[PDB]
Amino acid sequence: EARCACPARHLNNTNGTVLKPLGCHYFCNGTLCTAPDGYPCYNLTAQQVRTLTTYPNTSCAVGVCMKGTCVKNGTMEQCFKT
Amino acid sequence: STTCCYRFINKKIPKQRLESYRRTTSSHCPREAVIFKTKLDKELCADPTQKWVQDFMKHL
């Protein structure tokens, strides 16, 4: 908990929505942390992750974290890395 | 700019335990946060809606 109170990189988008992480896991200190349930997220396919770049080049599945899984909600966004 | 906080350090950390580092996360992060650093050099996420923090940032 306190250990997982550390910041990590989120992905950006051209949709004017909140930044969102790749999946619901992140690394802090010596802990591999899990985003809180309800936390927004992007669920990208292995292929989508392989081609992820600094500009949008695929439709990114928006999702909600629940016990470490990014459950897709149906919404798609033009996500990208900075 | 894309660094965001998933969770916060709930309890107040005494001023004697924190360094001078301060960074406000993007307004586009799911959760509004300020980042401080402990004297152990650990970056820690803090809720700016906690008077414990507004006091510290004023102190800086």
Residue numbers in the entry:
A (entry chain A): 21 to 102
B (entry chain B): 8 to 67
What do the study authors state?
Evasins are chemokine-binding proteins from tick saliva, whose application as anti-inflammatory therapeutics will require manipulation of their chemokine target selectivity. Here we describe subclass A3 evasins, which are unique to the tick genus Amblyomma and distinguished from “classical” class A1 evasins by an additional disulfide bond near the chemokine recognition interface. The A3 evasin EVA-AAM1001 (EVA-A) bound to CC chemokines and inhibited their receptor activation. Structures of chemokine-bound EVA-A revealed a deep hydrophobic pocket, unique to A3 evasins, that interacts with the residue immediately following the CC motif of the chemokine.
To achieve this, we mutated residues Tyr44 and Leu39 in the CC + 1 binding pocket to Ala and Pro, respectively; Pro was chosen as it occurs in the corresponding position to Leu39 in several class A3 evasins. We found that the Y44A and L39P mutants exhibited increased affinity to most chemokines with aromatic CC + 1 residues but decreased affinity to most chemokines with aliphatic CC + 1 residues. In the case of L39P, the affinity decreases were only small so this mutant bound to 21 of the 24 available CC chemokines with affinities tighter than 100 nM, compared to 17 chemokines for wild type EVA-A. Consistent with their increased affinity for chemokines with aromatic CC + 1 residues, both the Y44A and L39P mutants exhibited substantial enhancements in their potencies for inhibition of both CCL2 and CCL7. To validate the structural basis of enhanced binding and inhibition of chemokines with aromatic CC + 1 residues, we determined the structures of EVA-A(Y44A) in complex with CCL2 and both mutants in complex with CCL7. Thus, the increased breadth of chemokine binding by EVA-A(L39P) resulted, at least in part, from the removal of negative selection. The detailed structure of the hydrophobic pocket may enable a class A3 evasin to exhibit preferences for chemokines with different CC + 1 residues, as observed for wild type EVA-A. Alternatively, the pocket may accommodate a relatively wide variety of CC + 1 residues, as observed here for the EVA-A(L39P) mutant. It is noteworthy that five of the 14 identified class A3 evasins have proline at the equivalent position of Leu39 in EVA-A, so the wild type forms of these evasins may recognise a fairly broad spectrum of CC chemokines. Indeed, incorporation of such elements into EVA-A(L39P) may facilitate tailoring of its selectivity to different subsets of CC chemokines, as needed in different therapeutic contexts.
